[PDB]
Design a binder for this molecule. Structure first.
Ligand SMILES: Cc1cc2nc3c(=O)[nH]c(=O)nc-3n(C[C@H](O)[C@H](O)[C@H](O)COP(=O)(O)OP(=O)(O)OC[C@H]3O[C@@H](n4cnc5c(N)ncnc54)[C@H](O)[C@@H]3O)c2cc1C
Ligand SMILES: Cc1cc2nc3c(=O)[nH]c(=O)nc-3n(C[C@H](O)[C@H](O)[C@H](O)COP(=O)(O)OP(=O)(O)OC[C@H]3O[C@@H](n4cnc5c(N)ncnc54)[C@H](O)[C@@H]3O)c2cc1C
Lengths: 576, 575, 52, 104
């Protein structure tokens, strides 16, 4: 380790890797630190799902996700266990056990909130949905000029899409995908439009999809190297970043205080520019541990003096979930162009179609797949081929239906798909609500309790706002039930429900963006620069100040690209 | 150079034993694995050795669950009759979701699973490496028990070095000692309690570097700067499908592989062929090559080559529970303290006399207890929050013919919840020995194939009547009797037999003996396949005995002996 | 089932189970208050909960 | 086959059944409240030896039925409560409520 760099980046997730891509590529001497470790194979920070074995066994990936997500704030447990043997040590009170947080009100939590500490962050296991926000969900980047605002957003989103390798046709040969998309399109009669979920992914074969990750954005290899001989980049894993040291003036950051987890030692690191991309929760913890906002339980008799909006106006999306079992009608419809003679298993059983016939309801390639599956597998009672790729359908947020939707199959911490119903029939429904930012919804940090890395313990004080957020959430639940019925009934064991608050992992607004610190109740400006500080920048979903339902990461990356343009324009790389 | 001195199938710890031996001895080695490097820059290393997992050890259970893929899942017959009327609804229990229609659900090892990753199961195992005593141990020397003992002592010693096995990495756990000392007191000399021998090196009071395949051999391609005269290439994502027999059945001529990334298939040439793909997949590879018999066993048509392959399979019975430490034991932790006043109040104090001969515990223990009780007066227990886990065993003996572990560690089952303090909880796992019986089989379908288009494994297994069954129940009773001395059962973790094969200690699938016919076996004591000059098998599949203790060290020892034979009989090519 | 129906618990302590998947529109408690005939005098850890 | 083993509990003054002066039950009578733990010492040592004896004894007949594994039942489920208005010869010396004619 040198101790002096042009740029230091805290966190190796996709957003940190956005700053690395832009700034290493611009010739800056860059260091990036992550509290977590390299594990994803030789491609550092890559998606863990990109193994042949996971793609042959995609339900097991749910276990990988569950293992790496560490709960943010677990309240004290009050479950009664009164069948201990009389000889066993038996509590007299519900005392603080097993890492729990006594500061946390169990009834005002985001209990599902969790973080991932590994190189590449959560992009080592995410579901890769990268939609754009329309105006209603998005913060303004230009005031009093909507055309210019739309233009700037389209410019940034276009660049973010190419960084992630976002596309909308990787699942276009799936029979299940098309069956569902086409049925929904027909049922809604132009009242709503449906499309493939935009996904950060590149298909490699009919049975393998290279899902994108941080690695896609920046390969995280130390530089200079053979492929980039004039670039300078060093990644330092297993390094807990603990503070950014303020000057007394609060006009500049003077160093970064780090703890090397392997040797145990602490060091101070110097850069011209400091970028914090540690996530929505941990950016905030770092800043609060460094003297921004206020440590301890919020006290309005005693408002912070620096960045008083930090950790207020936090938003998390309401999430509803169910799975369905495909209707008899839609299954029969897969094979509507086949002529069938005889009984499966008999010597003269026959499934045939006429290629190119004007009366066919499906393209030739679909009918070829169906006929071959039915003929080659006469023991199997479905017309859908065994390795048909999954459905990836959406109708995007609109004023008339102000929630994001995903009608798909993918792996999440809660996905448990089971064994008695054939998986070809099963579709997942996830609808995502938008949450109004309210001052009273907070993420704060204990002045007494510490987490496993000896940092102040995160504590939430959150409820979904009454009024619009709550009315929309329940209308959203209703829309899922109404819409999913057009495809099939609910799968027993996956009935319509609200998911534990935060399980969705789309927290925002924890260090929010706006034009004016006071008037827009915010922490950073539209260059993601922290107000008052010449050289401190924050990236991530914690920047997003609006109520949004769609998946936030693409939008956070686009803000990061704009942040990088300010940096390139105002700091000089050191001579190489 | 698609010609090698040695090819090894599988990068788990046993393949890595062959690589360590043979790379070291100057051979041009290639190793293939069907899985991929997914463990960090240390190739094939233990996935538990991250700071984050060691601070969240209970979460590792999810990692193991994720990487164990079931070997044989029978057709599901569960009735779901609450589907909506509009939903497609089956009329029969057809073959769904990759299930194996050949498999009888009542004669399965349903808990059996495999791990396809570089490093194999050593990327997530619990690192217990006991030696087998004579009763559980295969013979290497016939009729000279002193010579047999000496050969095993040498091989095991070398295997323990390879694994970095030790027995005192937990000596400064209060919980460990609390449990060990109480058990030794209660058995009044009938049984010996000691630390589980563990393949691990402690790095700090809160961090242990668990050993893995990586520890045995680093899996870096060679030559490299640290090993300039060595020759090693590792080829991940390569499914190995058949070894080609000459017509004489005296030599292997080729290893046929399928590169999963490019999709292409190749025929690899070596002087020496080593199969170390696990007890299930070594057998699959051999059967797909014409050894044994493909398909449902047929007594009226016994195989001509290797007739014992896939017969005499053994798996251990496993019983498990957790307990909550007794109030007596918790009080005894603080037996040396003088405690006055009430916690949280001004007058409260906890003192002890350092070095006093009337103390039951050493000063390090009393200091830790004193500081915890004084610094955390809101906590009602005397055990420090970061105390390491217990790691206790009494090893298999004639009068108690099961292995025991009295400990905490991560496996695919048995996760904790949050209601009982973790410091009170202890896991009890007792492992039975299974008599080898010709009717217990692992065979492969001639029509159903698995996810890599290879013949589908199918088990025909029940625990033998007689000794095996009687000992399994006596073992359960033993666990109930012993655990009671430490505390009552933890609700939700009551004493139970685990699903057959969850324990993943499968042996005897390609078993070892002196004489193919007389010892009903597939390899000799050099682990060489009878009749074949240049084919060797490594792993637990080789072990032909009824054993209770954890098998991997014993398989590794057998692999070292195999390497000695290779070194005596083949010459490395010129570098 | 007949036995289960006729046995009425003697002392049921206040319930502290967390239910955090209510819809945002549903009335949602701020405290673990005395619900459903429970006994606030009863220490849940010094009970005969099975008594009926 | 079902196995139910029943332990004996030492009578201890501190183990109580009392009645609220504020909370009432469904029949508007004072609400019963327990203050109970199994006594340490003999009651507790016997209870756990008892568990062990069930496991030892039942093994001679068969293994445990999955789903009905050896356990302690919730305190009181057994419905054999005693000593709430206890008998003895002398009210004071035998710490009791009724004499051997069950007269108060
Ligand atoms: C299973 C799952 C599914 C998802 N699906 C989607 C999707 O479909 N679409 C979508 O947009 N979003 C999805 N997400 C969310 C997406 O992964 C996150 O929004 C995104 O990764 C955030 O990027 P980031 O770089 O800001 O933070 P992260 O990805 O969280 O990375 C931040 C990092 O900084 C580190 N760190 C934390 N503290 C410190 C410290 N003190 N010092 C040093 N380093 C530190 C971490 O170890 C970590 O790698 C999903 C997430 C999960 C887990
Ligand atoms: C959670 C758990 C805990 C355990 N704890 C312990 C412990 O405490 N003590 C103990 O002794 N053991 C225990 N074990 C078991 C121990 O892991 C195994 O016995 C040991 O890893 C066997 O090593 P091996 O090299 O023979 O096989 P494996 O580790 O199974 O490796 C064989 C490999 O070959 C591969 N392969 C398979 N088929 C092919 C093919 N066709 N072509 C190419 N490559 C192929 C695999 O991908 C794999 O890497 C545990 C296992 C688990 C999962």
């Amino acid at each position: 380790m040198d101790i002096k760099y042009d740029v230091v980046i805290v966190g190796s997730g996709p957003i940190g890797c956005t700053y690395a891509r832009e700034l290493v590529g611009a010739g800056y001497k860059v260091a990036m630190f992550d509290i977590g470790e390299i594990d994803s194979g030789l491609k550092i920070g890559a998606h863990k799902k990109n193994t042949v074995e996971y793609q042959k066994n995609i339900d097991k990936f749910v276990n990988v996700i569950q293992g790496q997500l560490m709960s943010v704030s677990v309240p004290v447990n009050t479950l009664v266990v009164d069948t201990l043997s009389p000889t066993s040590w038996q509590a007299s009170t519900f005392f603080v056990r097993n890492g729990s947080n006594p500061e946390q009100d169990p009834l005002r939590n985001l209990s599902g909130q969790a973080v991932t500490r590994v190189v590449g962050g959560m992009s080592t296991h995410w579901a890769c949905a990268t939609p754009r926000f329309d105006r209603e969900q998005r913060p303004l980047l230009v005031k009093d000029d909507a055309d210019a605002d739309d233009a700037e957003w389209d410019r940034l989103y276009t660049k973010a899409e190419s960084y992630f390798q976002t596309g909308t046709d990787q699942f276009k040969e799936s029979i299940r995908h098309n069956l569902v998309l086409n049925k929904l399109t027909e049922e809604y009669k132009g009242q709503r439009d449906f499309q493939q979920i935009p996904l950060a992914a590149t298909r490699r074969s009919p049975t393998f999809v290279e899902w994108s990750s941080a690695n896609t954005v920046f390969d995280l290899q130390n530089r200079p190297n053979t492929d980039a001989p004039e670039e300078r980049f060093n990644l330092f894993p297993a390094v807990a970043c603990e503070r950014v040291v303020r000057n007394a003036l609060n006009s500049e950051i003077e160093s970064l205080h780090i703890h090397d987890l392997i040797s145990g030692d602490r060091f101070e690191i110097k850069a011209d520019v400091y970028v914090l991309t540690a996530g929505a929760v941990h950016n905030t913890q770092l800043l609060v541990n460094s003297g921004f906002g206020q440590l301890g339980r919020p006290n309005p008799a005693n408002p912070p003096e620096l960045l008083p909006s930090l950790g207020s106006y936090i938003t998390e999306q309401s999430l509803v979930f169910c799975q369905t079992v495909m209707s008899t009608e839609l299954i029969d419809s897969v094979k509507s162009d086949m002529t069938i003679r005889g009984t499966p298993g008999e010597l003269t059983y026959s499934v045939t179609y006429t290629p190119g016939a004007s009366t066919n309801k499906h393209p030739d390639w679909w009918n070829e797949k169906v006929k071959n599956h039915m003929m080659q597998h006469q023991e199997d009672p479905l017309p859908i081929p065994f390795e048909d790729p999954e459905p990836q359908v959406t109708t995007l947020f609109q004023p008339s239906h102000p929630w994001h939707t995903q009608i798909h199959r993918d792996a999440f911490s809660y996905g448990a798909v089971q064994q008695s119903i054939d998986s070809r029939l099963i579709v997942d429904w996830r609808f995502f609500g938008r949450t109004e930012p309210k001052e009273e919804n907070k993420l704060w940090f204990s002045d007494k309790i510490t987490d496993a890395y000896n940092m102040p313990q995160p504590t939430f004080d959150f409820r979904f706002p009454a009024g619009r957020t709550s009315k929309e959430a329940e209308d959203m639940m209703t829309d899922m039930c109404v819409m999913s019925a057009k495809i099939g009934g609910f799968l027993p064991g996956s009935l319509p429900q609200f998911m534990e608050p935060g399980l969705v992992l789309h927290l925002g607004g924890t260090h929010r963006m706006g034009f004016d610190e006071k008037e827009d109740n915010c922490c950073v400006n539209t260059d993601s620069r922290v107000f008052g500080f010449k050289n401190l920048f924050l990236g991530g979903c914690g920047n997003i100040p609006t109520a949004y339902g769609a998946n936030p990461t693409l939008t956070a990356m686009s803000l990061a690209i704009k942040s990088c343009e300010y940096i390139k324009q105002n700091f000089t790389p050191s001579p190489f």
